[PDB]
Design a protein around this ligand. Structure first.
Ligand SMILES: C=C1C[C@@]23CC[C@H]4[C@@](C)(CCC[C@@]4(C)C(=O)O)[C@@H]2CC[C@]1(O[C@@H]1O[C@H](CO)[C@@H](O)[C@H](O[C@@H]2O[C@H](CO)[C@@H](O)[C@H](O)[C@H]2O)[C@H]1O[C@@H]1O[C@H](CO)[C@@H](O)[C@H](O)[C@H]1O)C3
Ligand SMILES: C=C1C[C@@]23CC[C@H]4[C@@](C)(CCC[C@@]4(C)C(=O)O[C@@H]4O[C@H](CO)[C@@H](O)[C@H](O)[C@H]4O)[C@@H]2CC[C@]1(O[C@@H]1O[C@H](CO)[C@@H](O)[C@H](O)[C@H]1O)C3
Ligand SMILES: O=c1ccn([C@@H]2O[C@H](COP(=O)(O)OP(=O)(O)O)[C@@H](O)[C@H]2O)c(=O)[nH]1
Length: 450
C-alpha cells in the first residue's frame, strides 16, 4: 500500500471503538494503518492482523505523573489532561522514528487523533504532518462547548446558582438550564480542556464526526461556521460493529437466551463503561425493572455499584424468569437482535448512535458530561426515547419502560426510531450524506501530499 494513516485514540472504550471502526473503513479504502496506543487499556492486537500497533507514552519505566494513576474507576481519566500537558516530546519522537524507518515507496498521508488530544496539533505541525480530528461525541455537544463563554456570562456554570433549572437556556432553547449544569458540573477541569480542544480542532486539516447529517441537521451550520477545515459526517456503526475493540470478554451466552424471547419483548439495559451509582439508586433501578413487568438483559460492569465488587446487594432469584444480569456483551450485535424492543442507556454517544443505527428506541438516564445533552436532543428533537431527567424513582422507571415498549401512546417513539434507522441506511447509498462524506474524506486524504 502506497499511503499510510497513523491513528491515535484516547484509551477508553468510547474512544477506542470509533477510531478502530474508522481505521477499518480507511483500510477498506486501501490505506495501510498504524495505531499509536498507550499500554493502558490496550485492545487485543491479535484481533487486528491487518494493523500495526505501536505502544507509546506509558512504557516502563513510567513517568512520575502517570506511574500511580488508578487503572479503573472515573479517576483513570486523569491520563487525558496529563498526556496533553506532557506527551508532546514522546509523540514527536515516535512519529519521527516511524517516518525514518518507512519504505521509500510508502509515505504517511496524515495523523488522525481523538479531538481530546489537542496537544497533537503542534506536534504534527512541527513535522509538516497534517492532523485530522475524530469527534467521538455529537455535533450538538460541540455547539454547546462553543457556547460556554455565553453560558458562563449567564451564571449557568455556577453550581451554587440553583435558579431557572427547568427553564429553556437563554440563546440555546433546545437545552434546559439543568442540562448545562449537569454537563459542565466539572467546570474547573473542563473549562481549560474544552477551550484547547476547540482551538486545536479549528487549527486541524479536517474533522471526522461519528454522526450523520439527518441525525443532527440543526447543528451543521454551527460546524461549517466554526471549523474552517472540511467536516465529514460518517456513522461508523453503519459500516461495522466495534466488537473487535472490546476491552472486556463478551458474554455470548446471551444470544441463546435472546433466541427464546418474542420479538421486541426485551429491554436492553447498560449504564456505560465508567458509570457508578449508590446502593440506594441501584436497588431503585432493580425495583423499576421488576415493576415494569418487561423481560430485560442488564449489563452491570463490576464497580457500577458503590460498595460492592458486582451486584452483591441483589437477592438470589430476584429479577425472575424475565431478567438476566451479565458483565459485558457485544452491544451493537445485541441491539440488532429481533428480541430487543428498547434500550435503557446512560446516553453515551456510541451507545446512542448504535441504538439509532439499529432502530431501537431509548430510555435515557445520564451521568453528566455530554450525556444529558445527548438525552435531551434524542428525547425532544428526534423523539426516539424518554428522558428520566429527575433521578431514579421505581414508578417513573416502570412508566418510561412501558411507554416505549408496550403503550399505544409510545407507538410514535417506536416508529420514529424505525424511520431514523432507515435515514441512516439511505445516507450510505450513492448520493447520500454519509456516502458523499466518506468519498470526499478518501479524496481529501489522498490529496494531502500534493
Ligand atoms: C475530557 C475529560 C477530562 C476528564 C479527566 C478526568 C476527570 C473528569 C472525568 C472529570 C471528573 C474528575 C476526573 C479527575 C475523573 O473523575 O477522572 C474529566 C472530564 C471528562 C473527561 O473525558 C471523559 O473521560 C472518560 C474516562 O475517564 C471517558 O470514558 C469519557 O468518554 C466517553 O466518551 C464518549 C465518546 O465521546 C461519550 O459520549 C461518553 O459520554 C463518555 O463517557 C470522556 O468523556 C468526554 O467528556 C467530555 C466532557 O465535556 C466530552 O466533551 C467528550 O466528548 C467526552 O468524550 C475525563
Ligand atoms: C471536502 C468536503 C467534505 C464534504 C462531505 C459532505 C458534507 C459537506 C458538504 C459539509 C456538510 C455536511 C455534508 C455531510 C453534506 O452536506 O454532504 C452533502 O449531503 C448531500 C445529502 O444531504 C449529498 O447529496 C451531497 O453530495 C453532499 O455533498 C463536506 C464539505 C465539502 C466537501 O467537498 C464535501
Ligand atoms: O456490554 C457492553 C457495554 C458497552 N459496550 C460498548 O462500549 C461503548 C460505550 O461507549 P459510550 O460512548 O456509549 O459510553 P462510555 O461507556 O464511553 O461512557 C459502546 O461502543 C458500546 O457498544 C459493549 O460493547 N458492551
Amino acid at each position: 500500500r502506497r499511503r499510510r494513516i497513523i491513528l491515535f485514540p484516547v484509551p477508553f472504550q468510547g474512544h477506542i471503538n470509533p477510531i478502530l471502526q474508522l481505521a477499518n473503513v480507511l483500510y477498506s479504502k486501501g490505506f495501510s494503518i498504524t495505531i499509536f496506543h498507550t499500554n493502558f487499556n490496550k485492545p487485543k492486537t491479535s484481533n487486528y492482523p491487518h494493523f500495526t500497533f505501536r505502544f507509546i507514552l506509558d512504557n516502563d519505566p513510567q513517568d512520575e505523573r502517570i506511574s500511580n494513576l488508578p487503572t479503573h474507576g472515573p479517576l483513570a481519566g486523569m491520563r487525558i489532561p496529563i498526556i496533553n500537558e506532557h506527551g508532546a516530546d514522546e509523540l514527536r519522537r515516535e512519529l519521527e522514528l516511524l517516518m525514518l524507518a518507512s519504505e521509500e515507496d510508502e509515505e504517511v498521508s496524515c495523523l488522525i487523533t481523538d479531538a481530546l488530544w489537542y496537544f497533537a496539533q503542534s506536534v504534527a505541525d512541527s513535522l509538516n504532518l497534517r492532523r485530522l480530528v475524530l469527534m467521538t461525541s455529537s455535533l450538538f455537544n460541540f455547539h454547546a462547548h462553543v457556547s460556554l463563554p455565553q453560558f458562563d456570562e449567564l451564571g449557568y456554570l455556577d453550581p451554587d446558582d440553583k435558579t431557572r433549572l427547568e427553564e429553556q437556556a437563554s440563546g440555546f432553547p433546545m437545552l434546559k438550564v439543568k442540562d448545562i449544569k449537569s454537563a459542565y458540573s466539572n467546570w474547573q477541569i473542563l473549562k481549560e480542556i474544552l477551550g484547547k480542544m476547540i482551538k486545536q480542532t479549528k487549527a486541524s486539516s479536517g474533522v471526522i464526526w461519528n454522526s450523520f447529517k439527518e441525525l443532527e441537521e440543526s447543528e451543521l451550520e454551527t460546524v461549517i461556521r466554526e471549523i474552517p477545515a472540511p467536516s465529514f459526517l460518517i456513522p461508523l456503526p453503519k459500516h461495522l460493529t466495534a466488537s473487535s475493540s472490546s476491552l472486556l470478554d463478551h458474554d455470548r451466552t446471551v444470544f441463546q437466551w435472546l433466541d427464546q424471547q418474542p420479538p421486541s419483548s426485551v429491554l436492553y439495559v447498560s449504564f456505560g463503561s465508567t458509570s457508578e451509582v449508590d446502593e440506594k439508586d441501584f436497588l431503585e433501578i432493580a425495583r423499576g425493572l421488576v415493576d415494569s413487568k418487561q423481560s430485560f438483559l442488564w449489563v452491570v460492569r463490576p464497580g457500577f455499584v458503590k460498595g460492592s465488587t458486582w451486584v452483591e446487594p441483589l437477592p438470589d432469584g430476584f429479577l425472575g424468569e424475565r431478567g438476566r444480569i451479565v458483565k459485558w456483551v457485544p452491544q451493537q450485535e445485541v441491539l440488532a437482535h429481533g428480541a430487543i424492543g428498547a434500550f435503557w442507556t446512560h446516553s453515551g454517544w456510541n451507545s446512542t448512535l448504535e441504538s439509532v443505527c439499529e432502530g431501537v428506541p431509548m430510555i435515557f438516564s445520564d451521568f453528566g458530561l455530554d450525556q444529558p445533552l445527548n438525552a435531551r436532543y434524542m428525547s425532544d428533537v428526534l423523539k426516539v426515547g424518554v428522558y428520566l431527567e429527575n433521578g431514579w424513582e421505581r414508578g417513573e422507571i416502570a412508566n418510561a419502560i412501558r411507554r416505549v415498549m408496550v403503550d399505544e401512546e409510545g407507538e410514535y417513539i417506536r416508529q420514529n426510531a424505525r424511520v431514523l434507522k432507515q435515514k441512516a441506511d439511505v445516507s450510505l447509498m450513492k448520493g447520500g450524506s454519509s456516502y458523499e462524506s466518506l468519498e470526499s474524506l478518501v479524496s481529501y486524504i489522498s490529496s494531502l501530499l500534493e
